[PDB]
Every structure is written in C-alpha cells, then in structure tokens.
A paper describes a structure:
[name] catalyzes the conjugation of the 1’ hydroxyl group of D-myo-inositol-3-phosphate (ino-P) with a lipid tail of an acceptor substrate, cytidine diphosphate diacylglycerol (CDP-DAG), forming phosphatidylinositol phosphate (PIP). 1 D-myo-inositol-3-phosphate+CDP-DAG→PIP+CMP 2 PIP→PI+Pi [name] belongs to the class I CDP-alcohol phosphotransferases (CDP-APs), integral membrane proteins that catalyze the formation of a phosphodiester bond to merge a CDP-alcohol and a second alcohol, releasing cytidine monophosphate (CMP). The [name] [name] was identified as a promising candidate for drug development, due to its essential role in growth and proliferation of the pathogen and differences between the Eukaryotic and mycobacterial PI biosynthesis pathways.
In the apo structure the first 16 residues in chain A, and 15 in chain B, are disordered. In the metal-free form, the metal binding residues D68 and D71 appear to be almost completely disordered while D89 and D93 have better-defined electron density. Additionally, residues 149–151 (-FIE-), located on a loop connecting transmembrane helices 4 and 5, and eight C-terminal residues could not be traced in the electron density. The best binding energy was observed for binding mode #1 which was also the top solution in docking against both the CDP-DAG and the Mn-citrate complex structures.
Numbering used by the authors:
A (entry chain A): 17 to 148, 152 to 209
B (entry chain B): 16 to 148, 152 to 209
Amino acid sequence: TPIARGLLRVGLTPDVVTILGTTASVAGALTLFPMGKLFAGACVVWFFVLFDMLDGAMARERGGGTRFGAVLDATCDRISDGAVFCGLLWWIAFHMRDRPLVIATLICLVTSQVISYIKARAEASGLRGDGGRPERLIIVLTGAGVSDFPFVPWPPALSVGMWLLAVASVITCVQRLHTVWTSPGAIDRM
Amino acid sequence: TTPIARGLLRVGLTPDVVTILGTTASVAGALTLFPMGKLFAGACVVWFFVLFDMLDGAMARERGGGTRFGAVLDATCDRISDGAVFCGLLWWIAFHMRDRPLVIATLICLVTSQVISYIKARAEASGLRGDGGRPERLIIVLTGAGVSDFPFVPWPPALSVGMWLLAVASVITCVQRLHTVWTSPGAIDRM
C-alpha cells in the first residue's frame, strides 16, 4: 500500500497498472513456458498475480474504484489465465510425449474460463454463481515449478499438477451451476 | 420452426434438457471428428447443433417464459461448445499439420471466444453493457474447416484463412466490447 501510493505518484492509474501487469504476465507466460523455463515462468506469473492486486490498493488510496475498473480487472484475469495455460500447453504439446496431458491441459484452459464465466453470468441474471482461483493457479504453477525446479526437480509434478486441477476444475463447474440452480428465483419463469 | 418446440414440449422435455443434450452432442462431435481430420463432417455437425440449440429459446417462448437458470445454462453451454470446437480443430492443427502460426491463431480464437462472452457477462453483472463487435465467428471457422475438407473439391488453405481472420476479428471485438463497457453510464464514476 505504500507501493500503491508511489505508483499513483508517478501518473499511473489503477487501470493502467492492471493492463501493464496483465501484459507482463502474458508475455512472461508465453515467453518462458514454451521455452521449458517452467520455474521462472511460474515465479513471474505468481509475481504478476500479486502485483495486479495493487490495482485495488491504488483505487482505495484514491477514494474509489470504478465499475469499469472492476470489469477490466476481471477480463484481464481471464486473459492472463488463458495465457498461462496456453504457454504450458505449447511446452506440453510440442516438447513432451504425453497426449493425455495435452488433454488435461486443454480442460484446464477451458474450465479456467468457464468457471469465471458461470459466476459473472449468474450475477448478470441476479443469481449466485460462486464456490468450489488462486488455489487453482497455486496447483498448476507449483506442479510446473517443481517439475522444472532449479535443483532436485520432480518432472511428474507438472502432470500431477495438471490432472488434479483438471478434475478439480470440472467439479467446480458442476458445483457452480448447482449454486445457480439453487439460487432464489432461479426457476421463476419470465 | 416452432412446431418442433411444440412437440418436444408435449413429450415432457424442458428447454434446459434440450440445451444439455444439444451441447453434449456438439462437444462429442467436435472432439470426435475434428481431431480425426474429418473437418467437413465436424463443421456440419457443429452447425446442426448450433441451430438445434435455438430450440431451447423456441420452447421458452412457447412456454410463457424462460428461466434465469436457463439463460445462465444456455450461455455457459455456448462457452463449453465453443471451447470444444476450437479444441478439436487445435488437435488436428497441432499434431496433424505443420503450421505453428496457425496453432497460434487457433489458440487466440480459443481464448477470445471465451473472453468476448465474458466481457459481456461481467459488464452486465456490474450493470453496464458489454456487447457489440458469435454466429459469424462460428460461420467463419466452420466454413474455413468445411471448405478445407470439402468433399471431392477441397481447398485446404480455407482453414488457415478462416482462423486468421477470426483471430484478428476476435481480438478487435474484445477491445470494442471493453470500450462499450467504458462508455456505459456509470462505468467510470469513482466509488
């Protein structure tokens, strides 16, 4: 929060900081992961996960965020996650011989979008759509970093990371739709 | 074509069930045919079930109302279905062609097909608008695919063309939609 104050000082808006963080996160994911630099990629993506929380600190230290800022931040989280899984997919698909893992990665790619989508769409209709994102990233990035750990790496960790997530994510989808289903007013006709 | 909705309502099928079955058939088709290189058949099937999913709305109108859950489920299903189309096409492109830029274009399409819808849903969740800039997206990629695998007289390049246009168009759409958020009433008031 002193960081947020100093970033305000220089002329950065919260929106600008989100876009730059997302741009840097995406570039990191798409530069490092396809090269097999999985640990470095993981550290950079975690960094910019954390660094993007500074948008809220900056908004608070300006007396307020905006609705657009909220929407932009969320959209950016989706873009950034898509980019994480796409970089990992590139490494996995073209530098390994684990097609089941390619499948698991694609499931993670799609479910990371859909899980968020269900929430936003549920809210757009006045229903709830949460339950079951930081921990999903924790799983896949820890798996990757350990797989490529600078010492005593455990290559299987990527696959374990991905497969767990893929299952966990699918369940989350089902869970979230259930929360939609059981929201008050969900079944009223209009 | 509301008598199909009439008859499916009679049998006891709700719009929600029809949406779930249509989406499942579309996903099975996309993930079964596209990775095999049967692009034309895959495009026909996906187009079929695109149209077949309109029957949920027909049933809702001829039922005195859809439901909120139904809307959410139908949209969620559209997202799943689009992910499946691009995932099957990607499998084909990535492992049975030698076109790395085309893989990139397909991944861009894969992600943007989600993000475009997301911007809309999230803006509405905040009381803003987030539309403008899907039917033509599928028209593009599926036409490219079907022509690429067109019976007897195929033109393979049509796939790469289809994807590359879509990828670009899709990126354009994303920024357009955010602009519509930005210009929504109340969007930039600080709170």
